[PDB]
């Protein structure tokens, strides 16, 4: 919205983005923050989908093994094949042999529900901890396994305001990054630099 949108830094122009300011320069604390929640959340999927595609395009799969008989970056061609489904017989290994935009549809329906239930449950405890409990800070849940946020200062620490600023930009990279990657497989030759 303005200087105090907190996602603003030096490598673009100052306070507000020129095209997308104008919707937020008039609106509420609620609208600015609700869009701050999305950009954090859209980054978090993109920060993970970056590596889920890195690991897929390589072809390494779950019998993780550092050397030349099982699945590593160097030999993603493991000898032992475990079994993903037990009713349709699709395995862990043959998903890795397909294209990443084809490997998604090889996951059976038992999987897609149980992704959606756990992700739907995390998204309900999502909604409670923030919009009802009024965290003054976006993307801000109780999810801190290692306890990074219990130090001498708390949420006013320079190391904490750094990492929020570090996380959004790495999400900002990853959103642009995965979108250029989806483009290269649907149309061949869309991003000709290093990665197809």
């Amino acid at each position: 919205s303005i200087n105090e949108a907190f996602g603003v830094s030096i490598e673009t122009g100052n306070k507000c983005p020129p095209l997308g300011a104008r919707i937020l320069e008039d609106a509420q604390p609620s609208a600015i923050k609700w869009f701050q929640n999305a950009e954090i959340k859209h980054g978090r999927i993109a920060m993970v989908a970056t590596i889920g595609y890195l690991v897929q395009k390589l072809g390494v799969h779950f019998p993780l093994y550092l050397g030349p008989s099982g699945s590593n970056c160097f030999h993603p061609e493991s000898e032992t094949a475990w079994l993903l489904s037990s009713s349709t017989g699709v395995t862990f290994s043959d998903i890795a042999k397909a294209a990443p935009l084809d490997a998604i549809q090889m996951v059976p329906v038992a999987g897609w529900m149980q992704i959606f239930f756990v992700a739907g449950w995390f998204e309900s405890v999502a909604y409670y901890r923030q919009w009802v409990k009024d965290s003054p800070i976006p993307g801000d849940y109780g999810y801190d396994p290692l306890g990074f946020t219990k130090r001498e200062g708390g949420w006013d620490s320079e190391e904490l305001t750094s990492l929020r600023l570090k996380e959004i930009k790495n999400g900002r990279l990853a959103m642009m990054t995965i979108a250029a990657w989806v483009s290269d497989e649907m149309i061949p030759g869309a991003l000709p630099v290093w990665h197809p």
Partner: peptide
């Protein structure tokens, strides 16, 4: 790269 400062005291113990 200042990783011991990155969390709390409980972070460094982990």
């Amino acid at each position: 790269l200042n990783l011991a400062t990155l969390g709390s005291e409980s972070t460094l113990a982990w």
